[PDB]
Design a protein around this ligand. Sequence first.
Ligand code: SF4
Ligand code: SF4
Lengths: 373, 170, 170, 176
Amino acid sequence: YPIDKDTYELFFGPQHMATENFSIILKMDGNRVVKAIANPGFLHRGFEKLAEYRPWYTNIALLLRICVPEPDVPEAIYSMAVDEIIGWEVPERAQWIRTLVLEMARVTAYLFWIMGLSFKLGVYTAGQWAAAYRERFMALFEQLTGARVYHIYTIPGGVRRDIPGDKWLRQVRDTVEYLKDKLKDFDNVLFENYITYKRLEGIGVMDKKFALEEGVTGPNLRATGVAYDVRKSDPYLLYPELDFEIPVLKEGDALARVLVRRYELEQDLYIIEQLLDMGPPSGPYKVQDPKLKNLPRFKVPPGEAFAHVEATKGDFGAYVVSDGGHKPYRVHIRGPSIAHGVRVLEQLLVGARLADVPAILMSLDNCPPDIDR
Amino acid sequence: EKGEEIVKQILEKAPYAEGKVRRERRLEFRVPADKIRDFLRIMKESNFPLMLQITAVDWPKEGEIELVYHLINVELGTHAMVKTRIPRDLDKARMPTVKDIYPAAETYERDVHDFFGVYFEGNEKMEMPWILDDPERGLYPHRKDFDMLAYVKKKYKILDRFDEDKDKYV
Amino acid sequence: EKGEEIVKQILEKAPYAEGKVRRERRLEFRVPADKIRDFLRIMKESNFPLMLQITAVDWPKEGEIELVYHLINVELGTHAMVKTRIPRDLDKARMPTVKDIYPAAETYERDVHDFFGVYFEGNEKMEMPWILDDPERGLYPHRKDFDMLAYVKKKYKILDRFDEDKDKYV
Amino acid sequence: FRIAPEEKVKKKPSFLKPWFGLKYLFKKPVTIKIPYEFIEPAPRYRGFHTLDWKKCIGCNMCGQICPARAIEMTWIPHPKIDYGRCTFCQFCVDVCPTGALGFIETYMLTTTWREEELLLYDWVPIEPEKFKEIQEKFKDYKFPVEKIEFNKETKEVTYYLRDGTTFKFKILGYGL
Ligand code: SF4
Ligand code: SF4
């Protein structure tokens, strides 16, 4: 006997192609939502009690898969944290390499978010273009380090493979100037039409006091009135000698949290163009010769370190503690989307129509491998 | 430097707050266990609204789940690491929930309760199947009393479709 | 009886809170001066939302304006009388304002500041002509340093249109 | 600090401006016809393993840095890498002291459901004459072992190569 008789519970499970892999059970009321709780954790590999059993250097390759769209931001934060507890002397060349791959993976993640938004917003042309122009960035990463995604690159000191040379650094100038001439054809399909602007207007109204104390750390609370950019507040890599300008709006409906990410794509591509004309000087790619050998037996002195870094969706931190041996005692990777599309999504879908459940789901850039950890 | 002034301003408003300032902005300090509830809103109202994950390390030698609490700033950019030390038995795994001051800890406490140990009193989403459905909820797999490769053998008989012995370590 | 249980529940959450229970519901207790600001929201969040007038008696023998603070309940009907003791000089007449927790004290503090002494730091409606315009704002007429019938004579020359001496006391 | 707009980012919606996304009705469509236009992957793409049998000392230094615990050791004391549990992270290359564990660009490896084609994932990697199976034999970039005939009690695996040597050797004992 069906014991609700009032509210039908359709729910977007995994096989839906709008939500990626996290089920949101929606207590629908005709065509609105009156209660939207989420069941995440269809992907819980475990990384607390799973990355505690590997040595310190080889715990990179196992830690990449905590966030799929950015295959460099999870390694470049753990590489920043094990940098701190040992206290290396990571040179200028390794700092520049890690800077440029941390920004080119970010423009890859923005392009993937555009393609993921357009696959569920109906319009396929902004999806196919976004994946096509992400593919040349993948084929440019493949010259450098290894595979397309999950390029195990940034070991705790420095990097693993340096630049090929003028065949590569001239090529990045070509694709960045190409995509900066190309980006004016994304606006006319995704941000200038009177469909999308009339589709995402006023849905999911996020207040100003509802973002800073809620768990939101990304660029989407920056569309609400909040002045917080971790690249600007505490620059970590070769950021202070860049002088980029960050966007802040006083709005907070859903399309405010989309135009801010479009402008972040524009200024980040201007960063990669500005970083390239600097060019890296000489130096080694590794950090030190004597305190790296016998690579499993890598006793680190005890203590702890926190690091945190800007992402496509949320400034998400790592937490490593070292007992004093060749094992991370606990490496916690705080997912960006833990209270960023699970808890704030519960008070965002209440009242919204069914057509703007997937669009709201992508207007926060919900990536399901981050809630579980 | 400015973090030393910030922690000096915090220590005026709280006695049990021994603040060590790491590199420039990593203001880490420990408080006693059942005193942070009357303390975290001093940290909220001063300058730190946003709360990151309630990450909790374990220690089998001295039995205590050291729940470190991650706070962050928005006007300066620092990141507090206020930490407690509560006992390790499931009987004594008690900790008052921070939901009246932070709605950030509505969901962080669900993961730290379903993963290992700690039970939070004044919250409603406690016995909800958040993650780790049955039969994984019946034992807490993220402490140090739960070892891998002797539960995985009792859940899956073979770990290699192929040959000899790829299930041990090192 | 039930007020004794209520004050026993309050004393668990606060050490410096020596609670005397009068007849049934007149729960009166004194706190130190610069500790009530970290204390009045313990009293707000427990059971006492509504705040009545910040009435402040004076004492010339022991110089202290004993600002008693009236709280009240809505679910039981009791009435707290939490009180401080701050010094009597206008230099030392300092008291942190309760506006972040009670919007009731937006206006009570204006009357107690314009009448006598005390200055409240973190408030905006301070030098506003609330009451007692010039030249009555320039001296505080509700303490014991201001005596009547020697200011009224300097403000009005005669107090009787009629005869002999109707201006003294007793 | 350095807030960029006041209303500079927010643009104006527009009726018939999406027709400028219609420009690619006549340009050349950007795809690769994979049967059969090849791609030529990178000169140092991470792929399969090319152990050298004359420099391997059996010190199991790779055994303790494999994140997925598949470089388990055999006797005649070389390792067999299984790609059952391998992420191609190539931490087994720059940690091998002698240098006897290389990696060459070979990634295409498709096997079917039957077990006899699934013994293909247990190979003691061959000498770098397998680079003469990447070139000089039909440059297809595929795994040049292509069937393995294990035999119980007569343990003599046979990497039946593309047309070269059958590469017989006995395997007895595992671990250390
Ligand atoms: S290929 Fe990578 S994962 Fe496999 S054994 Fe070698 S280092 Fe380990
Ligand atoms: S490849 Fe290196 S670690 Fe592996 S057996 Fe040979 S010498 Fe030892």
